[PDB]
Amino acid sequence: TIKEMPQPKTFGELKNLPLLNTDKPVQALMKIADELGEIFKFEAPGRVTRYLSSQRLIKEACDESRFDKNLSQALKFVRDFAGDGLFTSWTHEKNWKKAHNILLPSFSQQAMKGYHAMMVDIAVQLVQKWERLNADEHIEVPEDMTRLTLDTIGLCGFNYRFNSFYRDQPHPFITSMVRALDEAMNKLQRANPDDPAYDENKRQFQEDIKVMNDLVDKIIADRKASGEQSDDLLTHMLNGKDPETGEPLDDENIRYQIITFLIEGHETTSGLLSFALYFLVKNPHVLQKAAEEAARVLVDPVPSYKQVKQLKYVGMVLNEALRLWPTAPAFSLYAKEDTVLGGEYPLEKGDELMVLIPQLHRDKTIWGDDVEEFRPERFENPSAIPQHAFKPFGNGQRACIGQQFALHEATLVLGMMLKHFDFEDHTNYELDIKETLTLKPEGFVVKAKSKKIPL
């Protein structure tokens, strides 16, 4: 048969929408998953999506023959400032492919290699920021993670120096960028968008959207007036030609990929670093195993692309951190054509599936009776993991492009951190995940005793 689809409390016209009225809608969703199963329908006025929690359905939607990346309502609100950079453009849309072809070359094994030196530059500034601290003082973890991640993509990707550690308040781009994500996320719970009480908010949006674009204007500016032969993301953006179309990328699009890269390729990573340092601190053995591994690979003052390549264990910490709290928490798909999802559910073409990744990772029939446990080891043999079971980086062609960049910077700095530093959970931090589309622990702070080792 057709089963009728499960689906939570409705409120007349408001449908399900009053359910999502919260700061933590993805958490609220996980909860409703938990209550409802492996697939439920969420309907709001105008839209309708099905959330998918279960590996069985997921792998079925992960099939490119049947389901293309769809722009979820979130994305569409991100799309007002990201237009059609890779993140927030349809698959069937000239600029997507173009920018893939044009822009991928910047993520290949050799590029990783040149990027390395400049990662280190950063990860050093950090280590040093933490080494210059006095007794009384703690580190505000996800704040400083964010200082790292952003300066890194800046220099790696664009050879601009945000100079985040030269500053004690978060960076103007960070601030207007956060308020933009927060906007996109509230616009999702709005009964009535055109209400006059949201006028102060639309103004605030344009204000921050500008700040962001300003910084691109500074970035492109200073690439003009430069002794370059940079081989980064920007030179490719600005000068590659899509071998499929012979064409290069329009100014308008370039300026969307700049914004895209400066957001998506730093926020998700610092999220990880912080969930990572979280579970470490809450699990003092795991910390120790990985802090030792580390002592004995990073034998050099300053690490090296291959040195990072051996942090076997610390890449395992990271996968797990990402397994528990996937910091880009969902992707979206439409039905390419009418189908039936696991033999039970009739989809019309156009239908919006939507993958709760943090629930996908908690499918107990895949991972064991103990999903909520932070066990890096479950990542001893990559082999054992069924396909479509650990998708923290999306699916098929529509997949994190920055992936191996990300793991590489996390693995890098995590590792250096693990090596110069004793980390004391001084306040018994209880985990608070802040949502702004992506996820990041909030108010997570720690103390760091050095092992006075220079660099």
Ligand code: HEM
């Ligand atoms: C752990 C940190 C990261 C996580 C969890 C992550 C996760 C993701 C996810 C889930 C998607 C797909 C979203 C969707 O399919 O709708 C994605 C796509 C994308 N990501 Fe990441 N990512 C990370 C780091 C990065 C890095 C560092 C960059 C670049 C420097 C980056 C750039 C991109 C781009 C351009 C896309 C769009 C490509 C496309 O779909 O055509 N991400 N990433």
Ligand SMILES: CCCCCC/C=C\CCCCCCCC(=O)O
């Ligand atoms: C290009 C800018 C980067 C993208 C930033 C967003 C990262 C992941 C998107 C998360 C979508 C999660 C949806 C949350 C609530 C819902 O689906 O209703």
